[PDB]
Amino acid sequence: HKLVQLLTTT
Amino acid sequence: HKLVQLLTTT
Amino acid sequence: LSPEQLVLTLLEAEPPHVLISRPSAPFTEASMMMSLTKLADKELVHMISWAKKIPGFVELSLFDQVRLLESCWMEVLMMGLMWRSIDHPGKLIFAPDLVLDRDEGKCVEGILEIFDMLLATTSRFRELKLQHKEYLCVKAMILLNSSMDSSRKLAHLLNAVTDALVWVIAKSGISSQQQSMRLANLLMLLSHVRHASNKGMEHLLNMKCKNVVPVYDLLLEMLNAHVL
Amino acid sequence: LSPEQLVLTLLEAEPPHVLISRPSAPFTEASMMMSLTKLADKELVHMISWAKKIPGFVELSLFDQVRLLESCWMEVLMMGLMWRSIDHPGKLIFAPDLVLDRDEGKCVEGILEIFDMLLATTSRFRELKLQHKEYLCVKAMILLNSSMDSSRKLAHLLNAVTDALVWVIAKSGISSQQQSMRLANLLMLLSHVRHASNKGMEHLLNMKCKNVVPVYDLLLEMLNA
Numbered sequence: 209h210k211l212v213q214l215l216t217t218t
Numbered sequence: 219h220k221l222v223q224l225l226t227t228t
Numbered sequence: 229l230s231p232e233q234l235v236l237t238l239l240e241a242e243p244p245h246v247l248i249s250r251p252s253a254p255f256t257e258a259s260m261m262m263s264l265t266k267l268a269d270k271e272l273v274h275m276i277s278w279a280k281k282i283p284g285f286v287e288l289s290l291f292d293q294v295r296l297l298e299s300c301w302m303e304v305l306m307m308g309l310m311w312r313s314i315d316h317p318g319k320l321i322f323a324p325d326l327v328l329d330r331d332e333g334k335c336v337e338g339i340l341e342i343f344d345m346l347l348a349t350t351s352r353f354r355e356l357k358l359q360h361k362e363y364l365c366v367k368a369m370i371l372l373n374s375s376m377d378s379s380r381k382l383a384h385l386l387n388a389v390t391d392a393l394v395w396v397i398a399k400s401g402i403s404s405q406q407q408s409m410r411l412a413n414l415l416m417l418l419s420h421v422r423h424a425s426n427k428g429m430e431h432l433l434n435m436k437c438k439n440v441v442p443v444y445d446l447l448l449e450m451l452n453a454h455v456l
Numbered sequence: 457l458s459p460e461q462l463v464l465t466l467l468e469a470e471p472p473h474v475l476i477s478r479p480s481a482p483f484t485e486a487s488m489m490m491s492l493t494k495l496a497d498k499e500l501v502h503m504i505s506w507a508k509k510i511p512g513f514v515e516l517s518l519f520d521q522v523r524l525l526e527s528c529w530m531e532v533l534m535m536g537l538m539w540r541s542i543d544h545p546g547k548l549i550f551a552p553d554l555v556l557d558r559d560e561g562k563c564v565e566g567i568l569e570i571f572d573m574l575l576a577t578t579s580r581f582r583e584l585k586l587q588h589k590e591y592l593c594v595k596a597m598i599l600l601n602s603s604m605d606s607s608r609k610l611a612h613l614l615n616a617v618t619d620a621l622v623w624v625i626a627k628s629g630i631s632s633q634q635q636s637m638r639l640a641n642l643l644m645l646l647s648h649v650r651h652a653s654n655k656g657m658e659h660l661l662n663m664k665c666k667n668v669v670p671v672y673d674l675l676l677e678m679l680n681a
């Protein structure tokens with residue numbers, strides 16, 4: 209899931 | 219016309 | 229006309245208390261849904277009479293009157309439901325003979341989601357201690373702001389109801405900062421009422437299409453017109 | 457954090473404008489849908505970064521952050537769109553090189569209705585003379601009010617931004633009565649923004665099912681919620 213990546217991994 | 223009947227009668 | 233007397237007219241426009249004339253009985257999928265639609269149809273008739281009592285509404289072009297009511301009806305119904313349920317936490321007071329809760333919403337697929345939304349927004353109004361006069365103004369604003377010679381008149385009327393809500397709040401005697409804060413919190417909750425009504429209409433349309441519920445003449449027209 | 461510091465923080469957080477080029481040939485239903493969706497997808501990435509800059513947002517539970525964004529993304533996107541179009545009446549400024557006219561919506565069945573709504577609402581903001589700093593607060597309020605004790609914290613975050621909007625309005629100098637009326641007039645437009653976003657959302661979901669255009673990656677995920 210992209211949204212979770214950008215919220216926490218980016 | 220049901221809405222219109224009620225908007226034009228009392 | 230002062231804000232105070234405009235609010236008096238909204239008080240006077242208030243629709244009567246409606247009952248569905250149902251003998252107390254455990255609700256099932258069929259009775260609950262037939263009860264909700266039967267009630268909405270009756271409330272719609274009174275909603276029309278209510279709107280005509282709002283000073284200046286009947287002076288709008290017929291087309292605008294029809295357009296405003298076809299777009300906001302479910303929101304106005306839900307706002308009324310929330311006011312009625314405010315002093316009854318955990319419950320949705322549709323009517324004296326139609327009091328429903330959460331585990332009863334479970335009985336019909338897709339209803340629980342709507343009951344939860346209704347219950348949560350009601351809880352929010354309860355925490356803010358929504359006052360009767362505030363409810364009167366907000367309900368009228370939902371009707372007049374649902375717009376999506378006569379247009380000009382509509383704007384004058386919406387501004388008048390807005391001026392009245394501001395007056396109601398100023399009257400509570402709280403600080404100016406607190407008044408602006410309250411004004412913003414109440415108006416923002418409208419998005420939540422709108423959200424619940426949108427899901428409410430989506431569910432009803434599916435029930436119409438499935439002929440699961442009898443769709444009362446006026447309810448059907450209002451539903452089809454709104455959807456269209 | 458004082459109201460002014462919150463406003464300044466939002467100002468800095470404003471996403472940079474996404475550049476997208478207008479197709480070479482005249483628009484077709486596909487080239488227009490590909491243009492709007494490609495833009496949205498790119499704007500969505502900057503939106504997530506913008507959200508993380510809103511004071512207190514990253515302190516909310518991850519599941520609340522995801523829930524808020526999934527619920528308001530199109531509304532936030534359209535609010536931005538309308539602000540960018542504020543000073544170019546009759547036009548929608550999707551991006552520097554993608555200025556679409558009300559009429560160019562004809563090529564996509566169902567779009568014109570959305571363009572009309574957006575333009576009308578934009579006109580209304582133009583009529584109220586919406587200012588940049590009021591715009592910053594309103595857009596953040598859209599995100600925080602999409603509540604569609606992390607919830608205590610959410611209420612507290614929204615009150616903070618609401619507080620800053622009141623501060624900005626008070627800074628215009630108008631009378632207290634007029635300040636209250638302007639606040640109301642500004643928030644009452646949130647229903648209209650939300651209406652257009654619901655229609656754009658329904659339109660987009662349907663354009664997906666018909667494969668009239670590819671909807672994946674960030675955009676798709678956000679679409680399903």
Ligand SMILES: O/N=C/c1ccc(-c2ccc(O)cc2)c2ccccc12
Pocket residue numbers: 264265267268271305306308309322339342343428431432433435
């Ligand atoms: O398919 N379900 C349709 C449906 C139809 C009407 C209402 C309603 C009745 C009275 C009232 O005052 C407000 C809302 C509903 C309320 C909640 C879920 C579904 C509803």
Ligand SMILES: O/N=C/c1ccc(-c2ccc(O)cc2)c2ccccc12
Pocket residue numbers: 492493495496499533534536537550567570571656659660661663
């Ligand atoms: O199928 N309809 C799809 C669709 C997808 C995205 C947007 C949009 C793009 C950029 C922006 O900043 C705001 C909104 C749309 C705007 C207006 C109509 C339809 C749209």
